[PDB]
Design a protein around this nucleic acid. Structure first.
Lengths: 82, 372
RNA sequence: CACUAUAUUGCCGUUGCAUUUUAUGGC
């Protein structure tokens, strides 16, 4: 429930700086060895994408609130000069 | 809203709340503000009664959204003197789950507001100690605040997380305090609280080894591995000789997923001890990482060898060459000792022969004559 | 080759089980 949701939230917050996804044992060993080759990923690029998205939402909220404060200053100067 | 709550159709009340949200959603209250303490307390009592009535679910969420929009200066100054005045723990937990989301959307200008509210949140975390849900919510909120950003507040939050981690002995509280210690280690990687990684290994890794299916090891061991890797990534040379228990936990972490464990091993490989890994891998290769025989650390032992054999071997490895060929002899000798899945043993022997060929290419002419 | 051994149709309409089974007609 909420415990599992907060646990997954803290896990994803910890792994946000990890950027990872989420019996034929010779095949398992070879797959785990080739996963070291596949581990040369574009995690810096996807982190730049997420950071630019966060910067975009931050600039959007800051510009909207600053325009709201400008309208507040216009209304307060209007009600003052009245 | 309190009159409707003291009265309590339900869909009629939900339509009344949705009409209230569509009527109220502001800048009128902002132009009234910019008396003021009375307006803060009035909107705070309005929000507290709103959460007491709403703690048609989307209509209640829209009503709470209008209340949070009209009532993070206002959201911080309302709860800063009313974090104790929020009476019920359910209303307190809902207010804490809303306050972090409303606060961590915009920042980087007003540091001192959070820097003087962090002591208040840490005192609310120390006072509300018998409410584990509020404790974990305060842990997540303080970790997000330290990721957003104060030395006294940093030390207070770090000490509260260390006390919530060392004597935790509870699954969710320990996992939440480990995240707070991890985010504090990312923010202020202080040498103080030295009893941090030595407590985390022998506490959490041994607890995850003792609890097989009772506790959430899929929620515990991954965060334990991320904390153990982040501590050594922050303080590199402070754990340049204490890396063996970290590698043991990251290798024998059967609860940790494959890509997460491989990424943690790669981070520990590109981390500290560029020469002191050859004196470190031999004890695990002898005793620890070769007695499992359940493929888990068997996939990673040759990878941990190949990391220092193909990314770190140098003149320091030529100076420490005796333990290198010693580990090569032990690996080439342990083939019949690894008495399970002989085709995979031949695959691991091929990998050991390739890593031994890389080590022989790294070893020079005079350095390997007694080794010959 | 020796191993390791991993445990009816692109869509739509059908006989028929003591899940398969089975031959039809729309793109």
């Amino acid at each position: 429930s909420q415990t599992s949701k907060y646990q997954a939230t803290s896990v994803v917050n910890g792994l946000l700086s990890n950027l990872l996804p989420g019996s034929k044992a010779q095949l398992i060993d070879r797959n785990l060895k080739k996963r070291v080759q596949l581990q040369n990923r574009d995690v810096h690029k996807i982190k730049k994408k997420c950071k630019l998205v966060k910067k975009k939402k931050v600039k959007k909220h800051k510009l909207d609130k600053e325009q709201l404060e400008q309208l507040a200053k216009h209304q307060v100067l209007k009600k003052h000069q009245h | 809203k309190k009159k409707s709550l003291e009265s309590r159709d339900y869909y009629d009340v939900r339509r009344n709340l949705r009409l209230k949200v569509y009527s109220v959603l502001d800048k009128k209250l902002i132009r009234n503000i910019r008396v003021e303490l009375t307006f803060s307390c009035i909107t705070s009592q309005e929000n507290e009664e709103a959460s007491d009535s709403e703690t048609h679910t989307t209509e209640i969420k829209e009503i709470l959204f209008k209340v949070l929009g009209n009532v993070v200066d206002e959201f911080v100054n309302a709860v800063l003197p009313l974090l104790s005045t929020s009476t019920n723990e359910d209303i307190r937990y809902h207010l804490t789950l809303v306050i972090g989301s409303k606060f961590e959307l915009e920042g980087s200008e007003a540091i001192p507001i959070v820097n003087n509210v962090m002591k208040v949140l840490l005192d609310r975390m120390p006072l509300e100690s018998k409410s584990v849900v509020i404790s974990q919510v305060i842990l997540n909120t303080m970790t997000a605040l330290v990721s957003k950003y104060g030395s006294i507040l940093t030390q207070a939050l770090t000490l509260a997380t260390e006390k919530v981690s060392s004597d935790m002995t509870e699954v969710k509280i320990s996992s939440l305090a480990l995240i707070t210690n991890c985010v504090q280690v990312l923010g202020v990687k202080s040498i103080a609280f030295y009893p941090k990684i030595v407590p985390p290994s022998i506490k959490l890794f041994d607890a995850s080894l003792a609890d097989s299916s009772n506790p959430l090891k899929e929620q515990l061991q991954v965060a334990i591995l991320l904390l153990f890797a982040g501590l050594i990534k922050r303080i590199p040379s402070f754990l340049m000789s204490n890396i063996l228990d970290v590698l043991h936990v990251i290798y024998f972490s059967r609860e940790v997923d494959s890509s997460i464990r491989l990424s943690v091993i790669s981070l520990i490989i590109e981390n500290i001890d560029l020469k002191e890994v050859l004196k470190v891998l031999f004890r695990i290769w002898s005793t620890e990482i070769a007695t499992s025989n359940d493929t888990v650390a068997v996939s990673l032992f040759l990878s941990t060898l190949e990391s220092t054999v193909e990314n770190i071997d140098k003149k320091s490895a030529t100076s420490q060459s005796p333990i290198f060929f010693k580990l090569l002899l032990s690996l080439f000798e342990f083939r019949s000792i690894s008495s399970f899945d002989n085709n995979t043993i031949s695959r691991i022997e091929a990998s050991v022969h390739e890593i031994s060929n890389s080590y022989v290419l790294k070893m020079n002419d005079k350095v390997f004559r007694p080794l010959f």
